[PDB]
Amino acid sequence: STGSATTTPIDSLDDAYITPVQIGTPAQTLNLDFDTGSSDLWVFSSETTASEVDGQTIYTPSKSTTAKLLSGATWSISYGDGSSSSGDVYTDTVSVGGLTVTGQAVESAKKVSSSFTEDSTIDGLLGLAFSTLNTVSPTQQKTFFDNAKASLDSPVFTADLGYHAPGTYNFGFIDTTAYTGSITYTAVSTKQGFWEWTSTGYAVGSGTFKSTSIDGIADTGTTLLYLPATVVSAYWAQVSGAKSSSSVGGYVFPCSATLPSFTFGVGSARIVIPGDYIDFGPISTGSSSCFGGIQSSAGIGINIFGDVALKAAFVVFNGATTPTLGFASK
Ligand SMILES: CNCc1nccn1C
């Protein structure tokens, strides 16, 4: 089998992407944030604390004839941006772009933190990291991909995120019309439960390529590109007036600037992130100070190839017995 669904930016900055997902019988369609950096499929629901729901579409398991309470199971998760959610668990039928999994763990939120409430466009998350990170207790649950894998034509999914435009998540096949040139594959470590890989280096604008190993994760659920302070300083040094602002929480730059591109290595191949992709707009409405899309990972403990990087590429998440990652230009 295969599946194919369109993924759409939630706002004009590409802060995140939402993909429609059918849950239950009859289907209840929720718009979920597909997140290759976590492993829980959780949704706003009829069980979510009422004051914490503000415009989201909710899953109501009592209206699904295929929903079953997973007795005794709870979940609780904290994300890298300081947000969190928690609740109980149902199994139900979940379909993405025509690909159906029966008995998928659908984690129903009883509580969500403020930044989830305040974002009306995201109805929950669909985790696509390794199932070893799944938070369900006392019996850990499998991701949608893990459950689907055996049935897929090929045990892969692909992320093709758009810049200020829709894109595509495919399951079970590689769309050879969706990228240019060849896909370069690179080794993955699953030891931390992430799609963790090692970039071979970087360049800033038309500058020379620096060969240097950068270990990091391919994370569709993080907006920005987080890299070592040395790399990030080298990038922003090429932008007049750019500076790291402790008060704002990262590098900012004059909105009048023209940003240079940033290139990252995948083996001997090169992915070029256009300068425009690195502009996250005014820090506050009407400001002429703009927020940068490349930021230091120093305070995080891991480098993160988030949407800023991934949207410059066609990305293959190869879930074969030995997983790998593939990147192509597009
Ligand atoms: C904005 N913070 C919550 C959130 N929304 C999508 C992902 N995450 C972690």
Side-chain angles (χ1 to χ4, degrees), residues 1-62 64-67 69-110 112-141 143-148 150-190 192-242 244-330:
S1 59
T2 65
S4 181
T6 298
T7 192
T8 302
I10 64 166
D11 62 25
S12 63
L13 300 178
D14 298 349
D15 282 317
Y17 297 76
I18 50 175
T19 308
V21 176
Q22 281 71 48
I23 307 176
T25 311
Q28 300 179 39
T29 298
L30 275 66
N31 295 328
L32 306 187
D33 184 350
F34 283 23
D35 180 9
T36 64
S38 71
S39 305
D40 289 50
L41 192 175
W42 74 262
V43 295
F44 277 81
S45 76
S46 56
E47 301 179 325
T48 311
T49 299
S51 65
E52 298 180 347
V53 184
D54 193 352
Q56 298 80 9
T57 295
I58 63 169
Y59 171 57
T60 304
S62 67
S64 175
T65 58
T66 41
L69 180 71
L70 185 62
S71 185
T74 58
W75 62 280
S76 181
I77 192 163
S78 298
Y79 295 101
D81 68 357
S83 67
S84 62
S85 52
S86 62
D88 55 18
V89 186
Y90 293 81
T91 56
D92 208 341
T93 303
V94 173
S95 301
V96 176
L99 170 65
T100 300
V101 170
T102 58
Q104 174 64 45
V106 175
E107 302 173 34
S108 170
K110 290 174 112 75
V112 304
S113 65
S114 55
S115 70
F116 283 114
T117 301
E118 291 158 1
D119 179 13
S120 64
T121 70
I122 291 178
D123 302 325
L125 267 61
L126 190 149
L128 292 169
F130 293 89
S131 293
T132 53
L133 293 178
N134 175 268
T135 77
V136 178
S137 178
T139 309
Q140 188 171 65
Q141 303 293 304
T143 69
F144 175 81
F145 179 53
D146 204 350
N147 283 324
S151 301
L152 295 178
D153 289 0
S154 178
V156 304
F157 68 90
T158 66
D160 181 7
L161 302 180
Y163 166 68
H164 294 175
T168 305
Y169 281 102
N170 291 329
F171 291 83
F173 74 105
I174 288 163
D175 179 358
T176 60
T177 74
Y179 57 87
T180 62
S182 58
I183 304 174
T184 297
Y185 289 87
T186 197
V188 163
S189 172
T190 63
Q192 295 190 79
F194 300 122
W195 293 92
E196 186 172 0
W197 65 289
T198 301
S199 172
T200 49
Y202 71 99
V204 174
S206 64
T208 62
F209 186 84
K210 176 72 166 181
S211 293
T212 185
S213 297
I214 304 172
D215 181 286
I217 66 170
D219 187 358
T220 59
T222 290
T223 313
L224 308 185
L225 175 52
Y226 295 89
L227 293 173
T230 47
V231 178
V232 177
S233 182
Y235 179 80
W236 289 108
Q238 298 303 311
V239 178
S240 291
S244 183
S245 168
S246 52
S247 60
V248 175
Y251 281 89
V252 297
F253 68 93
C255 294
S256 62
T258 299
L259 296 177
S261 62
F262 184 91
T263 299
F264 65 92
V266 182
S268 61
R270 306 289 181 253
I271 300 295
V272 181
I273 305 171
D276 289 345
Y277 289 27
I278 298 162
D279 177 17
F280 280 77
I283 60 173
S284 289
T285 301
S287 180
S288 71
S289 182
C290 275
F291 197 67
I294 295 178
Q295 297 293 346
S296 179
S297 64
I300 297 174
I302 193 151
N303 301 304
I304 308 176
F305 294 87
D307 296 336
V308 163
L310 301 183
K311 77 184 162 195
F314 178 88
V315 188
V316 181
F317 293 82
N318 171 27
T321 304
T322 300
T324 65
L325 272 172
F327 292 81
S329 294
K330 66 188 185 189

